[PDB]
mmCIF file of all heavy atoms in Angstrom:
data_model
loop_
_atom_site.group_PDB
_atom_site.id
_atom_site.type_symbol
_atom_site.label_atom_id
_atom_site.label_comp_id
_atom_site.label_asym_id
_atom_site.label_seq_id
_atom_site.Cartn_x
_atom_site.Cartn_y
_atom_site.Cartn_z
ATOM 1 N N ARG E 101 125.513 108.897 112.944
ATOM 2 C CA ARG E 101 124.224 108.446 112.451
ATOM 3 C C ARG E 101 124.410 107.254 111.527
ATOM 4 O O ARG E 101 125.339 107.215 110.714
ATOM 5 C CB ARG E 101 123.493 109.571 111.710
ATOM 6 C CG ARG E 101 123.050 110.708 112.609
ATOM 7 C CD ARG E 101 122.312 111.778 111.833
ATOM 8 N NE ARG E 101 121.870 112.861 112.696
ATOM 9 C CZ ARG E 101 122.589 113.946 112.958
ATOM 10 N NH1 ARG E 101 123.786 114.127 112.427
ATOM 11 N NH2 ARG E 101 122.093 114.869 113.778
ATOM 12 N N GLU E 102 123.513 106.279 111.650
ATOM 13 C CA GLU E 102 123.571 105.049 110.869
ATOM 14 C C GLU E 102 122.391 105.013 109.907
ATOM 15 O O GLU E 102 121.240 104.895 110.341
ATOM 16 C CB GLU E 102 123.562 103.822 111.775
ATOM 17 C CG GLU E 102 123.360 102.505 111.044
ATOM 18 C CD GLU E 102 124.663 101.877 110.590
ATOM 19 O OE1 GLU E 102 125.699 102.577 110.605
ATOM 20 O OE2 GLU E 102 124.651 100.687 110.217
ATOM 21 N N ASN E 103 122.678 105.107 108.612
ATOM 22 C CA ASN E 103 121.673 105.023 107.560
ATOM 23 C C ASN E 103 122.076 103.916 106.597
ATOM 24 O O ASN E 103 122.897 104.137 105.699
ATOM 25 C CB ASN E 103 121.524 106.354 106.822
ATOM 26 C CG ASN E 103 120.848 107.419 107.661
ATOM 27 O OD1 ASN E 103 120.693 107.269 108.873
ATOM 28 N ND2 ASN E 103 120.435 108.504 107.015
ATOM 29 N N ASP E 104 121.501 102.728 106.785
ATOM 30 C CA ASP E 104 121.738 101.577 105.905
ATOM 31 C C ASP E 104 123.221 101.228 105.834
ATOM 32 O O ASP E 104 123.851 101.303 104.776
ATOM 33 C CB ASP E 104 121.161 101.828 104.510
ATOM 34 C CG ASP E 104 119.649 101.962 104.516
ATOM 35 O OD1 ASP E 104 119.055 101.988 105.616
ATOM 36 O OD2 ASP E 104 119.055 102.048 103.423
ATOM 37 N N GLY E 105 123.783 100.843 106.975
ATOM 38 C CA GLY E 105 125.157 100.390 107.018
ATOM 39 C C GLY E 105 126.202 101.438 106.718
ATOM 40 O O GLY E 105 127.182 101.148 106.027
ATOM 41 N N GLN E 106 126.028 102.662 107.213
ATOM 42 C CA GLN E 106 127.012 103.718 107.052
ATOM 43 C C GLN E 106 127.109 104.523 108.337
ATOM 44 O O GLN E 106 126.092 104.847 108.953
ATOM 45 C CB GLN E 106 126.658 104.648 105.888
ATOM 46 C CG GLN E 106 127.698 105.726 105.636
ATOM 47 C CD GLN E 106 127.273 106.710 104.573
ATOM 48 O OE1 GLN E 106 126.152 106.643 104.059
ATOM 49 N NE2 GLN E 106 128.165 107.632 104.226
ATOM 50 N N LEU E 107 128.337 104.847 108.738
ATOM 51 C CA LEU E 107 128.589 105.644 109.929
ATOM 52 C C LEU E 107 128.944 107.066 109.513
ATOM 53 O O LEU E 107 130.005 107.297 108.918
ATOM 54 C CB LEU E 107 129.714 105.040 110.765
ATOM 55 C CG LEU E 107 129.360 103.825 111.623
ATOM 56 C CD1 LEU E 107 130.498 103.519 112.583
ATOM 57 C CD2 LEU E 107 128.068 104.065 112.381
ATOM 58 N N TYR E 108 128.066 108.011 109.828
ATOM 59 C CA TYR E 108 128.330 109.423 109.613
ATOM 60 C C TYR E 108 129.018 110.015 110.830
ATOM 61 O O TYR E 108 128.975 109.451 111.924
ATOM 62 C CB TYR E 108 127.036 110.189 109.330
ATOM 63 C CG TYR E 108 126.377 109.828 108.025
ATOM 64 C CD1 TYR E 108 125.147 109.186 107.999
ATOM 65 C CD2 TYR E 108 126.979 110.127 106.815
ATOM 66 C CE1 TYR E 108 124.536 108.854 106.806
ATOM 67 C CE2 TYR E 108 126.380 109.804 105.617
ATOM 68 C CZ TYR E 108 125.160 109.165 105.618
ATOM 69 O OH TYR E 108 124.564 108.838 104.425
ATOM 70 N N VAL E 109 129.661 111.160 110.627
ATOM 71 C CA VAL E 109 130.294 111.904 111.710
ATOM 72 C C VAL E 109 130.081 113.390 111.453
ATOM 73 O O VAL E 109 130.116 113.843 110.309
ATOM 74 C CB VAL E 109 131.791 111.554 111.839
ATOM 75 C CG1 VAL E 109 132.579 112.043 110.631
ATOM 76 C CG2 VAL E 109 132.362 112.127 113.126
ATOM 77 N N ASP E 110 129.827 114.132 112.523
ATOM 78 C CA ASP E 110 129.655 115.571 112.448
ATOM 79 C C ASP E 110 130.893 116.263 112.999
ATOM 80 O O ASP E 110 131.591 115.722 113.857
ATOM 81 C CB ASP E 110 128.414 116.024 113.223
ATOM 82 C CG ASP E 110 127.133 115.806 112.447
ATOM 83 O OD1 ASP E 110 127.206 115.279 111.321
ATOM 84 O OD2 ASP E 110 126.054 116.169 112.966
ATOM 85 N N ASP E 111 131.160 117.462 112.492
ATOM 86 C CA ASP E 111 132.317 118.215 112.964
ATOM 87 C C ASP E 111 132.170 118.569 114.436
ATOM 88 O O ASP E 111 131.060 118.710 114.958
ATOM 89 C CB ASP E 111 132.533 119.465 112.102
ATOM 90 C CG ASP E 111 131.371 120.449 112.175
ATOM 91 O OD1 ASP E 111 130.361 120.171 112.847
ATOM 92 O OD2 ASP E 111 131.477 121.523 111.544
ATOM 93 N N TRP E 112 133.305 118.671 115.118
ATOM 94 C CA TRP E 112 133.297 118.981 116.542
ATOM 95 C C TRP E 112 132.717 120.368 116.784
ATOM 96 O O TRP E 112 133.108 121.341 116.138
ATOM 97 C CB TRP E 112 134.715 118.897 117.106
ATOM 98 C CG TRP E 112 135.173 117.500 117.378
ATOM 99 C CD1 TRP E 112 136.091 116.789 116.670
ATOM 100 C CD2 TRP E 112 134.740 116.654 118.445
ATOM 101 N NE1 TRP E 112 136.252 115.545 117.230
ATOM 102 C CE2 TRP E 112 135.435 115.439 118.320
ATOM 103 C CE3 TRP E 112 133.828 116.804 119.496
ATOM 104 C CZ2 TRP E 112 135.248 114.379 119.204
ATOM 105 C CZ3 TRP E 112 133.646 115.752 120.371
ATOM 106 C CH2 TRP E 112 134.349 114.553 120.221
ATOM 107 N N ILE E 113 131.773 120.448 117.721
ATOM 108 C CA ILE E 113 131.166 121.713 118.112
ATOM 109 C C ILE E 113 131.270 121.854 119.623
ATOM 110 O O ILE E 113 131.320 120.861 120.358
ATOM 111 C CB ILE E 113 129.696 121.834 117.655
ATOM 112 C CG1 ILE E 113 128.793 120.936 118.501
ATOM 113 C CG2 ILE E 113 129.562 121.491 116.178
ATOM 114 C CD1 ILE E 113 127.334 121.312 118.443
ATOM 115 N N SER E 114 131.308 123.097 120.088
ATOM 116 C CA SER E 114 131.358 123.406 121.515
ATOM 117 C C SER E 114 130.137 124.228 121.892
ATOM 118 O O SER E 114 130.114 125.448 121.651
ATOM 119 C CB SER E 114 132.641 124.159 121.868
ATOM 120 O OG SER E 114 133.764 123.304 121.797
ATOM 121 N N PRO E 115 129.098 123.618 122.457
ATOM 122 C CA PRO E 115 127.929 124.401 122.881
ATOM 123 C C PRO E 115 128.315 125.432 123.928
ATOM 124 O O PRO E 115 129.140 125.178 124.805
ATOM 125 C CB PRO E 115 126.982 123.340 123.453
ATOM 126 C CG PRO E 115 127.439 122.052 122.856
ATOM 127 C CD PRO E 115 128.920 122.179 122.709
ATOM 128 N N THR E 116 127.703 126.604 123.828
ATOM 129 C CA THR E 116 128.041 127.734 124.672
ATOM 130 C C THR E 116 126.855 128.107 125.544
ATOM 131 O O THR E 116 125.696 127.866 125.192
ATOM 132 C CB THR E 116 128.468 128.950 123.836
ATOM 133 O OG1 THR E 116 127.356 129.404 123.051
ATOM 134 C CG2 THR E 116 129.615 128.585 122.907
ATOM 135 N N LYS E 117 127.155 128.698 126.702
ATOM 136 C CA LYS E 117 126.110 129.207 127.568
ATOM 137 C C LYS E 117 125.498 130.468 126.963
ATOM 138 O O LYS E 117 125.982 131.010 125.966
ATOM 139 C CB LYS E 117 126.662 129.482 128.966
ATOM 140 C CG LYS E 117 127.024 128.227 129.738
ATOM 141 C CD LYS E 117 127.420 128.542 131.170
ATOM 142 C CE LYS E 117 128.894 128.884 131.273
ATOM 143 N NZ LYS E 117 129.345 128.942 132.691
ATOM 144 N N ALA E 118 124.406 130.930 127.580
ATOM 145 C CA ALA E 118 123.698 132.093 127.052
ATOM 146 C C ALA E 118 124.599 133.321 127.012
ATOM 147 O O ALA E 118 124.593 134.071 126.029
ATOM 148 C CB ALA E 118 122.455 132.374 127.895
ATOM 149 N N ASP E 119 125.381 133.539 128.069
ATOM 150 C CA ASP E 119 126.336 134.643 128.061
ATOM 151 C C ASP E 119 127.594 134.297 127.270
ATOM 152 O O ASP E 119 128.337 135.204 126.868
ATOM 153 C CB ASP E 119 126.680 135.042 129.497
ATOM 154 C CG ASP E 119 127.357 133.928 130.275
ATOM 155 O OD1 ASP E 119 127.533 132.816 129.734
ATOM 156 O OD2 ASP E 119 127.717 134.164 131.453
ATOM 157 N N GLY E 120 127.848 133.008 127.035
ATOM 158 C CA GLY E 120 129.017 132.564 126.301
ATOM 159 C C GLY E 120 129.934 131.726 127.180
ATOM 160 O O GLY E 120 129.472 130.925 127.998
ATOM 161 N N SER E 121 131.239 131.909 126.993
ATOM 162 C CA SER E 121 132.292 131.291 127.795
ATOM 163 C C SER E 121 132.299 129.768 127.706
ATOM 164 O O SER E 121 132.991 129.114 128.488
ATOM 165 C CB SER E 121 132.201 131.720 129.265
ATOM 166 O OG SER E 121 131.115 131.090 129.917
#
Side-chain angles (χ1 to χ4, degrees):
Chain E
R101 292 181 179 90
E102 169 89 346
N103 288 13
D104 296 6
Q106 183 186 4
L107 282 191
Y108 293 113
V109 67
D110 280 2
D111 62 358
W112 281 107
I113 73 161
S114 289
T116 65
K117 290 186 274 191
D119 63 358
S121 74

